[PDB]
Amino acid sequence: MKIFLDTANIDEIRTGVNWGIVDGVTTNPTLISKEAVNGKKYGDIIREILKIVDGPVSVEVVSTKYEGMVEEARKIHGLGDNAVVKIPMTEDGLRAIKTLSSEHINTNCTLVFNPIQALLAAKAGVTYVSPFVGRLDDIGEDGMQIIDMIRTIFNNYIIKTQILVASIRNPIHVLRSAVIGADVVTVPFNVLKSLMKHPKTDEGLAKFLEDWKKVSPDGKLIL
Amino acid sequence: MKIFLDTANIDEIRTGVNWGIVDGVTTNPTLISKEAVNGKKYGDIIREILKIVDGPVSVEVVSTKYEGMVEEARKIHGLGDNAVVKIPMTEDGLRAIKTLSSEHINTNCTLVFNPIQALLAAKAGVTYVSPFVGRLDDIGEDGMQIIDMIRTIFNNYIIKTQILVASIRNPIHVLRSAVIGADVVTVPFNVLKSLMKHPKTDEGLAKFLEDWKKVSPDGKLIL
Amino acid sequence: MKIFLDTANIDEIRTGVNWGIVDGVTTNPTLISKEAVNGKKYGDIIREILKIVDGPVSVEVVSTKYEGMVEEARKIHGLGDNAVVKIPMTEDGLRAIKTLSSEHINTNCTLVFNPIQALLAAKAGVTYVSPFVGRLDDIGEDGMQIIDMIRTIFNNYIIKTQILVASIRNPIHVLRSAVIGADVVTVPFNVLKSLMKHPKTDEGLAKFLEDWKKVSPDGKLIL
Amino acid sequence: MKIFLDTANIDEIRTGVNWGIVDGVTTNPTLISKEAVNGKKYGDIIREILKIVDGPVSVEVVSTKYEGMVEEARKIHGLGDNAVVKIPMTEDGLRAIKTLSSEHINTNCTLVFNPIQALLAAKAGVTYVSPFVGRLDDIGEDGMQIIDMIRTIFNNYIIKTQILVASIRNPIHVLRSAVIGADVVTVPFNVLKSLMKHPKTDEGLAKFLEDWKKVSPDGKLIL
Amino acid sequence: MKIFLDTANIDEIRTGVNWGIVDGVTTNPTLISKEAVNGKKYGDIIREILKIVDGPVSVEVVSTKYEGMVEEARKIHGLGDNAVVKIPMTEDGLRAIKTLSSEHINTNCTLVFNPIQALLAAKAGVTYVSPFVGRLDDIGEDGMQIIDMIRTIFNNYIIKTQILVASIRNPIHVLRSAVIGADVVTVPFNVLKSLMKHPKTDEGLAKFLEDWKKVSPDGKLIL
Amino acid sequence: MKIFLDTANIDEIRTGVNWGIVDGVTTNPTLISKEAVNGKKYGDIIREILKIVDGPVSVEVVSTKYEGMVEEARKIHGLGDNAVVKIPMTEDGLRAIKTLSSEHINTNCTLVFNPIQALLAAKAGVTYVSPFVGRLDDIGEDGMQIIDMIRTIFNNYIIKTQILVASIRNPIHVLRSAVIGADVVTVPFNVLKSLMKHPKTDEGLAKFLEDWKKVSPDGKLIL
Amino acid sequence: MKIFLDTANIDEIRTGVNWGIVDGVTTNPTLISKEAVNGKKYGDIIREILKIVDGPVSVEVVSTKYEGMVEEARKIHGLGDNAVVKIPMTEDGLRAIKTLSSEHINTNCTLVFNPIQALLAAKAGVTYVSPFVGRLDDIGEDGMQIIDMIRTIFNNYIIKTQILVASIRNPIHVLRSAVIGADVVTVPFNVLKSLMKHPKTDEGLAKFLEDWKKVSPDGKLIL
Amino acid sequence: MKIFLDTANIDEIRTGVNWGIVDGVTTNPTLISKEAVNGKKYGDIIREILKIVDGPVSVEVVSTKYEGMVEEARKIHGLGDNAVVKIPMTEDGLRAIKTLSSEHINTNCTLVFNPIQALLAAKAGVTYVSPFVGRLDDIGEDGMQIIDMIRTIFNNYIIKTQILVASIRNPIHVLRSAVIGADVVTVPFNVLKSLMKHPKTDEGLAKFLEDWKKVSPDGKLIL
Ligand SMILES: *[C@@H](CO)[C@@H](O)[C@H](O)[C@H](O)COP(=O)(O)O
Ligand SMILES: *[C@@H](CO)[C@@H](O)[C@H](O)[C@H](O)COP(=O)(O)O
Ligand SMILES: *[C@@H](CO)[C@@H](O)[C@H](O)[C@H](O)COP(=O)(O)O
Ligand SMILES: *[C@@H](CO)[C@@H](O)[C@H](O)[C@H](O)COP(=O)(O)O
Ligand SMILES: *[C@@H](CO)[C@@H](O)[C@H](O)[C@H](O)COP(=O)(O)O
Ligand SMILES: *[C@@H](CO)[C@@H](O)[C@H](O)[C@H](O)COP(=O)(O)O
Ligand SMILES: *[C@@H](CO)[C@@H](O)[C@H](O)[C@H](O)COP(=O)(O)O
Ligand SMILES: *[C@@H](CO)[C@@H](O)[C@H](O)[C@H](O)COP(=O)(O)O
Question: Could you name the active-site residues (chains A, B, C, D, E, F, G, H)?
Fold first, then answer.
């Protein structure tokens, strides 16, 4: 399972990249607009993320019509080979996806909330599809069930579109995605940092350290 | 999973095809005769649909006897290479499918209501088999269960007949078909149009566009 | 399981009532406004339905604010002891339900789409809660799964609110409701009439009558 | 589980009753037509069964209309206290059951092929409902699955109508009925006879006899 | 669960009874005739077992006809109040059980090989029913499954006939019977003797006694 | 799944073959005795079936001893390449199958009633094994459960012997066989006929015809 | 699944071998010492069994120490290429297995009572591992559960050691072994003979032969 | 499944190695510090284990910072080609593993307590990952569940990192690990010795020996 970071915050991205556990980044119009304040320009934010991240970087078109989507998509693609164009699940978007796919431009279909929307995006040739589990949880439906169904459907038809679990809110979304077999999760920075941690790791490390000092007061391993 | 449109209404068909999500069309004598009114001829309706749709188009014979079915089948085949001959599940129908298969004429066995009828159709060499889930629902039996058994039976024997789920009434027939692994669903226009939609898609798009205006008054993405 | 009719059509109501199988009626502002045409007044329609139907008749308030809802509820209540006041799942609706329940006015909480909404309506003292299965099916979620969870939750806490399955579209919503153990279903007229029917019932009756004529030429049963 | 004999053959009935294993009898117009030949009159056959059998005896009305059904039902009831009036699952049939129930005349709703028909019959106050398992098997649906659903539905609502499994064709219909918990099975004579038998019972008997001969040549147990 | 000893060997019976774990005894014509050799009379063997065992003692009739079975049954009953009359699962046997039950003579229906035979025996009013699990194992069917179905059937109908598992060959028949909830098992002496034993019991006792000697050379517990 | 006809009636065989749905035929000494009446000779009946049927035709030996079985088997094989020699599950039968297998004569082991008998037949190299589901149903055991176990065992060991389900009595034996994945079912003619039929197929046909009349009074499809 | 005979009795071995159903033989020091009576020598018995049985013949070492086991194993091996050396699950036994496996001497690890014992034997390179199901049943644990776990463990690691189910007591140990997918069962003679038998096979053969005599008075099959 | 010894005690390791059942060794700073007393130097201890054990030996770094971990790992590596460098699940630890993996130094990520930590370790390229089952048991969580999830996750993604079950406390951790399919278990000496033993093995050997004495007073096997 690949792990992407779901943010437009450059500091967060730089840190996660520096940890070596980030395989890519997702953005969306809300996340970018949060960061493009106090003289910060969105064009600069996007270019900076593309430069810092080796992996796929998803950038969302803002037009709602086919022609505008395809034109924006081409500009996003021109910004770098790791750019992936994020396109909403709408009639115009499926059309754009079909065109872009034939032009060999990688795509990510977003705002997906059920498995049949996901199947339609796959049939358009989308590179990634992004179901929003946390927004389903928000409305009282267990969003991970939709991921499970999408995994079964894609398996049934040997679908090559990657399932990119998005709207992730906690480490159990992550654990369940892995057990299901989702291709990718994209996680907010707070969730990312928690994934490596466990109180028994900390306690175990401390005890080992303590016991080692019994035989090596300096606390080092001399071999 | 292929998605076919189940109608003879040419306006619905043009619209569905323009959306890019329609892989084919199914008709039947009721659907055609609905449109073949007020001067409009059934011969014209059938030809027009064949011209419009790139994918398979199922057209049903009306004869109930072997020789008549085969004669009509061959006329249907002659109207275009994408024509598929719909043949009912009867003794004469199984005979006709077996002959037409040997003549390399694609066939669709219809009016199937249990898994053994579907197996017989596959043994006759039919290209598609069409079990009717909504008409079983109508008589108080969950029609989707028959689709599940057919998928199992076909998997057991490596059967190459495609399961074409028909008499579809709602998007959950479609979802369950995909999870089962049916090869094709054929859906009425109303159902078709709902498949791309979800209220959280609409709401999410609105929010993205409101947030974007904050950093781009004109609402565009200049890259 | 009680069976209500979901319509404001007096002819459908009179017909179903004469069948002896209708235990009540549910209406809503759309169903009523459909029938208040050609000079037909909504006040007359409502009174006429109350008169014809011995069982509970749900009538929806139209105000969206607490004070208006309770004022309308009290007027609805005064139309006959079989009137049930239908109130939507909103903040003010819950406040209204709690007030009306204390006044011993029967209530039906409507526009419920998940089990926690239903639980909150029950906690407010509502008489019936109406989850909308068909509208969930419309958006690619199996609506019956919500009924099953509500049944379990209500059983856990010995909740006396009745589950009234609404937005019913076919006889399998009805079958599944009964197997789950929902208290009530409300069904459109087309669905209601279909519930008694089965082709083997027809075929079986025909054969019995044929066989009887062999021993009783006039088809009589004289004892 | 009660066991009824499904026949109008007087010799079968006397024999089964005299096995001590038969708790009642079901007839229908076909079964009676079979016996009422060569001068034998249906009225005499019906009286004789009522006479010989202590348990319930179901006799079916032939009228298809409400008034005729109720008239014939009252005549059937008049022939003896053990008479149960068989009424088909139709609109008129349900109305008749409701009337007859209020008159304290026992009723058995027949020609039932799905669980919701069975529920409607129960809601009309019927004493027994009779789903036809064998005739569902005939059309490629496992009829015992409808018995299982009806048992669950009736348990859910604490329904007092008895489930009377009919159209029984083999001893496995009988076994599965008992494991499900159906109230009654009605069985043809040849199936009845088979229920007592097993090859290992026969072999075990023969061996006990052979071993006993060694200790007692005359095969008696003298105590 | 009652545990009966399945033998006519008087030495085995005295031993088992002295252990305190034998609640009753079952015999059959083979078991008795095995012991009734070299001068020993079957009448004497039967009487001696009745005297020795406080609990129920099953003794099988040899007659195959109703009148003879009943005559023998009554003689068996007269030998002592703890006598239980074993009657085979045959047409005449069911008749005999029904008569003997009305005479308050306890009965045990034997040579039962499926759950429907067991149900018929219970309907005749039998005190115990004895399905033969080992003889089903002998013919390649897992006999315990029949016990499981019988327990379910009896639970469904609140049947008071006790399930007496017979033809027991090993301690896993006994364990599975207990987990199922059979009322009684009857076991051959060899199987009986193994039930109390386990190698870890033996080893644990040895260790306890070795450890105790360390604080009590004489190996006693002076309190 | 292959479908064979289980009969020796030549009219049935010709009719089924001429439906195109029959892949072979099974006979046995009873079925043949039925036809070999009024001067009709068994040798002529067997030759005629071999002649008319392109697929396998099973013919059963009558000798009960190894030498007679092998002698008769070689004669049966000599009548045509499609002949399959039916051999019962006995000690001599297994020896015969082994010999005949080494001679490249196809064999079908019959009178199989549990999964281990089926395994022994497979180990002897038999071409088909025929478990008798209906005869197990007769003695109160669900015979389809043995087919399920045999399918699992044969899958486990990659066994090439084909499972040929026999003693079929109804269409549900057929459905369950297909869902399990049995290689072949052999069915009596009346069961064969029933497999193609369904009331909704008939009703659907009638309605299509009625609707088509409106657009084409003569009921033709002129293209 | 291979079937071995578990005995040292030459008559049983010769009989089973002549049946064609025995694939090998297992012995152990108890079985051999049973047969080495009346001046019969264990060396002669072993050689005679090796001579009669074409398949694997397991012969157990008697030394408890590593050096003695390997010395005895090498002598066993020299008696014929079909000899398999049976070695107990002990520390020295595992060491011996590892040594012998390297020398390409086939081995069978015996006295195995749990799945981890079996895994350790496999890790030492053993040819067969023999878990003792009947001896577990003796102590109140279902021995077949250990076979199932060993099958799963061996499948997980693609282990080539064969599971040889031993201490078999009845035909259900055999049936369950086949369903689990054990490689071999070894069975006492009484069990082996029972595997071919079933009362419905006998009854069925008798009826066929009776029916045939109606058309062939001499009971012949002349073709 | 590979089996490692979890200890730094040379006496235990030499014993396990001599038994032939030990495939490698794990140590940690606590285990080493326990042995490095009364004049024993941790450096001699590590070297001695490396020498005695043919297979992988895991030795943990003590540094908590990236540079120090990588330096220590290289020293550890240099001590012998069978050295595996144990590195804790921390930020610097994952960085170290990635660097060491690129240097072809085998790594083992320790102090893992949930499946997502295990996945992160795998993603860094670690050779083995060691979840601590016993320490989860200590805090009231069944540690084996985490192993099951890791197995599923690794299977989903065809992950080559080996699952090394650690903190093992009893033989059922070992059994469950094998049933799950973990790649390796590492076990304390007391557990390891227990794995070969079972009381029925001891009992069975004793009996075999007693019976062989009957045939060969001196207990030898002369062939
Ligand atoms: C794009 C799809 O990969 C992502 O940036 C998604 O928009 C976010 O994961 C959505 O999360 P929220 O529900 O927190 O907006
Ligand atoms: C042909 C078979 O694929 C289709 O046109 C079917 O006839 C319809 O799908 C049947 O649907 P209705 O039950 O709604 O007529
Ligand atoms: C009131 C709640 O019982 C009912 O009238 C509901 O509004 C309808 O059942 C809604 O159904 P639709 O989704 O078909 O409007
Ligand atoms: C009445 C209902 O209890 C019965 O006589 C039923 O009509 C028969 O059981 C129906 O069986 P068939 O399908 O064999 O007519
Ligand atoms: C009487 C019924 O409880 C018993 O004695 C049975 O006859 C035996 O239990 C039958 O056992 P076998 O199959 O071992 O004879
Ligand atoms: C041969 C095996 O393929 C078949 O003819 C079987 O004998 C019959 O199918 C047995 O069926 P019955 O139980 O009806 O004789
Ligand atoms: C050797 C291992 O295959 C066999 O001879 C076993 O020793 C026997 O199967 C043991 O059976 P018992 O528990 O009946 O002695
Ligand atoms: C290293 C594998 O990472 C091992 O030595 C583990 O530290 C031990 O297996 C941990 O066991 P405890 O929980 O008993 O310390």
Answer: 86
